[PDB]
């Protein structure tokens, strides 16, 4: 049972890591898109 | 880049009826007057009092500048003169006042006043006279010759999508400078012409109500995914609590 | 056309095997006005404009409008039934836990 | 078994909360859309 619960802990970890990575990549992609459509380049 | 068109340039504003061509020209002239300079605005299809009233709803005050002796608003039908005398009067008047900005609204009103090559000759002479003196010329043209001689070109759109008409504008041409390549959507109001923030989405190219609908759809999808992740987290944690209870026993 | 202060364009177009009437204000100088292509009907009571169209798709007229209203109602009923069954299932699990506790 | 039923109660709660939030957000979205298509602005 202990080994099972340790495996579950590792699963929790991996899921949180994946969510954080997804948040990060969406912000990067949004910044890229807002760059390719912005008027910053002319200020 | 740099804050606008070059000074002695030739700018053509094009679009369909109701697009906003006259409003943009009036904004140009009103700004020119507001900086203390002088402007001349030659209208061939609307009267002076009517134009003033129409522009008043957009928040401009063309009357203030007429009463201050900084804006001369001249209105004459295309059939009042011959193509020669139209040019003669325009040149004489431009000479006397010594403007900084001259607007002709619209350039397409003279199409039936003569042959194509005659009206082109008149307009070419007007453009050359304006450009040799460093006077900025704003020409409004209705969409549907001398386009080639224009330094800037602003195309204004009012199209039907999704049972509504949405306004847009883009810079077809702006020689000598870097400028945006986006077809931006704008609105008219008591505050003048306001351009809305650019559109960011994987699909893109949505205007007006469809934009808000897609924003709502994206929010709904994000909420759905968040709930899915929540349930998965809760399920794995309940398995963990289980393993606990059994260990305790 | 150029010398006109207002411009009302009236449409009668074919969509879905029927002709539907519409009208919009192309031009109205000096004023603020709606930018909607509104659908109207003729009758013994004159010209009556129908309520504006609200839907994510939009731009549906005549019979297609009623069809989409019906489809939206059906989808709402489907989702409500789904939520109901889920609620009932979790509550039956709870009643179970009860019966076992009592025993 | 008690711990299980408490977990079920929490699940009921979360589901009801989510449904209420969904109702709310649909009303807000419907109001927004009916605004961007209405003639109120001219009264
Ligand atoms: N207070 C206002 N609020 C919102 N929109 C306005 C307001 N006043 C005017 N508008 C809009 O501004 C537009 C002005 O159109 P404008 O005359 O500038 O274009 P145009 O190309 O010069 O048309 P024309 O063929 O008459 O020359 C009106 O059609 C009207 O729909
Ligand atoms: Mg005009």
Look at residue A1 and give its three-state secondary structure. Answer: coil
B170 closest CA partner among B181, B159, B186, B158: B181
Sign for the pseudo-dihedral over CA of C81, C83, C86, C91: negative
Closest CA to C76 of A16, B56, D23: D23
Residue B49's nearest CA partner among B61, B63, B30, B59 is B63
Q: Using the structure block, give the residue that is written with the tokens 């004159």.
A: C46
CA of C24 to the centre of ligand 1 (A): 15
* Residue B194, Cβ density class (10 Å: 0-12 exposed, 13-18 middle, ≥19 buried): exposed
In this structure, are residues B31 and B193 in contact, taking their beta carbons and an 8 Å threshold? Answer: no
Locus of tokens 């009916």: D34
* Residue carrying the six token digits 């179970």: C96
Beta-carbon count within 10 A of D33 CB: 20
- Contact yes or no for C18/C63 (Cβ under 8 A): yes
Ligand 1 site residues (CB inside 6 A) read B 15, 17-23, 57-58, 188-190; C 2, 27-29, 31-33
How far is B135 from B132, CA to CA, in rounded Å? Answer: 8
Q: Which residues are within 8 A (CB) of B224 and not within 5 positions of it... i.e. 6 or more apart?
A: none
CA distances from B27 to B30, B206, C89 (A): 5, 27, 66
Answer left, alpha or beta for residue B172, where phi above 0 means left and psi between -120 and 50 means alpha: alpha
In eight-state DSSP terms, residue D36 is T
Instruction: Phi first, then psi: give them for residue C11, nearest 5 degrees.
Output: -120, 150
- Percent helix, strand and coil across chain D, each to the nearest 5: 85, 0, 15
Residue D35 is classified by DSSP as H
Which chain B residue lies closest to A18 (C-alpha atoms)? B229
Query: DSSP assignment, residue D22?
Result: H
Quickly list DSSP for chain B: --SSS-TT-EEEEEE-TTSSHHHHHHHHHHHHHHTT--EEEEESSS-HHHHHHHHHTTT--HHHHHHTTSEEEEE--TTSS-HHHHHHHHHHHHHHH--SEEEEE-GGGGGGGS-HHHHHHHHHHHHHHHHTTT-EEEEEEE----STT-SEEEEEEEEE-SSBEEEEEEEEEETTS------EEEEEETTEEEEPPPP-SSS----THHHHHHHHHHHHHHHHHHHHHHHHHHHHHHHHHHHHHHHH-
Measured at the CA of B69, the angle between CA B99 and CA B29, to 5 degrees, comes to 50
HSE-up (13 A, CA, CB side) for residue B46: 21
The pair of structure tokens assigned to B134 is: 């460093």
Residue C56: φ, ψ to 5° = -65, -40
Give dist(CA B209, CA C58) in Å, integer.
9
Query: What is the spatial distance between Cα C60 and Cα B31, in angstroms, rounded to a whole number?
Result: 43
Sheet strand arrangement including B71-75: B71-75, B39-43, B101-105, B136-142, B10-15, B152-160, B165-174, B184-189, B192-195
- Please list, in sequence order, all residues whose beta carbon lies within 8 angstroms of the beta carbon of residue B177, skipping any fewer than 6 positions away: B1, B2, B5, B6
| Interface contact flag, C56 B166, Cβ < 8 Å | no
HEC sequence for chain C: CCCCCEEEEEEEEECCCCEEEEEEEEEECCCCCCCECEEEEEECCEEEECCCCCCCCCCCCCHHHHHHHHHHHHHHHHHHHHHHHHHHHHHHHHHHHHHHHHC
User: Which domains, and CATH codes, for chain B?
Assistant: 1-210 (3.40.50.300)
Structure's resolution in angstroms: 2.9
**Neighbour order of strands in the sheet with C6-14:** C6-14, C19-28, C38-43, C46-49
- CA–CA separation, B29 and B31 (whole Å): 5
- Structure-determination technique: cryo-EM
Q: With touching defined as 3+ CB pairs under 8 A, do chains B and A touch?
A: yes
Which of C2, C3, C22, C19 shows the shortest CA–CA distance to C11? C22
Nearest ligand to the C-alpha atom of residue B109: 1
* B69 φ/ψ sector (left φ>0, alpha ψ -120 to 50, else beta): left
Signed CA dihedral, A41, B2, B8, B13: sign only: positive
Tell me which residue of B65, B64, B67, B142 sits closest to B100, measured CA to CA.
B65
User: Best mutation site among B12, B13, B14, B19 for ligand 1, i.e. most ligand atoms within 8 A of its Cβ?
Assistant: B19
């Amino acid at each position: 049972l202990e080994a099972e619960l340790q495996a579950e802990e590792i699963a929790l970890k991996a899921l949180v890591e994946s969510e954080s990575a997804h948040e990060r990549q969406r912000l990067a992609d949004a910044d890229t898109l807002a760059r390719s459509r912005g008027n910053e380049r002319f200020a | 880049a740099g804050g606008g068109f070059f000074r002695g340039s030739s700018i053509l504003v094009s679009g369909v009826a109701g697009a906003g061509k006259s409003s943009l020209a009036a904004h140009f002239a009103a700004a020119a007057c507001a900086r203390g300079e002088r402007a001349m605005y030659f209208s061939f299809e609307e009267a002076a009092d009517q134009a003033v009233r129409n522009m008043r709803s957009l928040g401009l005050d063309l009357g203030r500048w007429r009463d201050a002796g900084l804006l001369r608003f001249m209105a004459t039908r295309p059939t009042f003169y011959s193509l020669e005398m139209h040019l003669a009067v325009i040149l004489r008047e431009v000479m006397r006042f010594e403007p900084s900005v001259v607007v002709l609204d619209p350039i397409s009103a003279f199409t039936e006043s003569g042959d194509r090559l005659e009206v082109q000759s008149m307009l070419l002479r007007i453009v050359d006279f304006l450009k040799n003196r460093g006077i900025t010329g704003i020409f409004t043209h209705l969409a549907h010759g001398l386009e080639e001689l224009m330094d800037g070109w602003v195309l204004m759109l009012n199209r039907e999508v999704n049972g509504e008409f949405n306004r847009e504008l883009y810079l077809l041409k702006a020689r000598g400078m870097a400028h945006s390549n986006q077809v931006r959507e704008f609105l008219m109001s008591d505050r003048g012409i306001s351009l809305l923030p650019p559109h960011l989405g994987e699909g893109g190219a949505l205007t007006g109500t469809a934009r808000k609908a897609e924003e709502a759809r994206l929010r709904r999808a994000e909420i759905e995914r968040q709930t899915e992740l929540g349930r998965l987290q809760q399920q794995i944690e309940q398995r963990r609590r289980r393993a606990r209870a059994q260990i305790e026993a």
